[PDB]
Amino acid sequence: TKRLSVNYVKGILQPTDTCDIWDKIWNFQAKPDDLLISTYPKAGTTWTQEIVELIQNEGDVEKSKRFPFLEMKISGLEQAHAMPSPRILKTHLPFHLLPPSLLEKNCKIIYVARNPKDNMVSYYHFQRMNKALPAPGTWEEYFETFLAGKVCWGSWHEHVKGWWEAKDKHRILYLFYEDMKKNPKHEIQKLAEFIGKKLDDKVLDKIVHYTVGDWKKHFTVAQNERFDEDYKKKMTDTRLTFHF
Incomplete structure (x- = not known):
C-alpha cells in the first residue's frame, strides 16, 4: 500500500487529512461526563479503553453497548458527535x-x-x-528519527513530560503501562476510583481476569548508551520515572 501524506501542524507531524481539519479538531465540543484516554501511540490506548468499558459496566456481556479519536479522519469528530454520553474519547x-x-x-x-x-x-x-504514518526506514534510521521526535504526535519525551506537568492543575489520572502489566488489580482500582466507582473487593478480580524488557532484543548496547545519555539530558525532573 502506497503511503499517505504527513505534514507538520502546530509543531508536530500529523496525517495530512488531520492537518486539513485542525480548526475543527481544536473547536471540539466536550461534555462534562466525557472520559478521555490520552496516550502516545502504542502506549496502551486499546487496552485502557477495554478496562474502562468493563469498569463502567462491571458485567462483561452488557459491554457491547458503545472509541472516537478526536484528531483522526480517514472521522473521530463525527463518531464522537453521534455517540451517547458518557462518551469515551481517545x-x-x-x-x-x-x-x-x-x-x-x-x-x-x-x-x-x-x-x-x-x-x-x-x-x-x-x-x-499503517499507511497513514511515514515510512520508518530501517531500524537504525528509525532509532534516530524517534530519538529526535520526528514522528507523528512529536517527541515521546515532550509528550510524557507535558502530560506529567499537567496532572497538577488539570483532571488527569497518570498511569504507567508497566504498572498495569505488573499490578493490574491495583491499577484497575485507581482507575475505578478516579472515574467515580467505589467498586468491589471482587468485581476487580473479574475485570483483572477478563483483560516489558522486550526492547533489549532490539537495541544494541551502543544504541542503548546513546539513548540513555539523550534521555538524561531531556528528562531532568526525575519524579517522573519508568520501569524498563
Missing part, C-alpha cells in the same frame, strides 16, 4: 494541543505512559503497517 495529542473544551468542561482524562524503549519498538512496527 487522543494521541500532546497536552498543549488538547482541544480547550476538554479542560473547560473539566473532563476526566486518563493518560497512560509507557517506557520509551518498548514504545519505540512498538511504534516502529506500527509505522511499518
Whole structure:
C-alpha cells in the first residue's frame, strides 16, 4: 500500500487529512461526563479503553453497548458527535494541543505512559503497517528519527513530560503501562476510583481476569548508551520515572 501524506501542524507531524481539519479538531465540543484516554501511540490506548468499558459496566456481556479519536479522519469528530454520553474519547495529542473544551468542561482524562524503549519498538512496527504514518526506514534510521521526535504526535519525551506537568492543575489520572502489566488489580482500582466507582473487593478480580524488557532484543548496547545519555539530558525532573 502506497503511503499517505504527513505534514507538520502546530509543531508536530500529523496525517495530512488531520492537518486539513485542525480548526475543527481544536473547536471540539466536550461534555462534562466525557472520559478521555490520552496516550502516545502504542502506549496502551486499546487496552485502557477495554478496562474502562468493563469498569463502567462491571458485567462483561452488557459491554457491547458503545472509541472516537478526536484528531483522526480517514472521522473521530463525527463518531464522537453521534455517540451517547458518557462518551469515551481517545487522543494521541500532546497536552498543549488538547482541544480547550476538554479542560473547560473539566473532563476526566486518563493518560497512560509507557517506557520509551518498548514504545519505540512498538511504534516502529506500527509505522511499518499503517499507511497513514511515514515510512520508518530501517531500524537504525528509525532509532534516530524517534530519538529526535520526528514522528507523528512529536517527541515521546515532550509528550510524557507535558502530560506529567499537567496532572497538577488539570483532571488527569497518570498511569504507567508497566504498572498495569505488573499490578493490574491495583491499577484497575485507581482507575475505578478516579472515574467515580467505589467498586468491589471482587468485581476487580473479574475485570483483572477478563483483560516489558522486550526492547533489549532490539537495541544494541551502543544504541542503548546513546539513548540513555539523550534521555538524561531531556528528562531532568526525575519524579517522573519508568520501569524498563
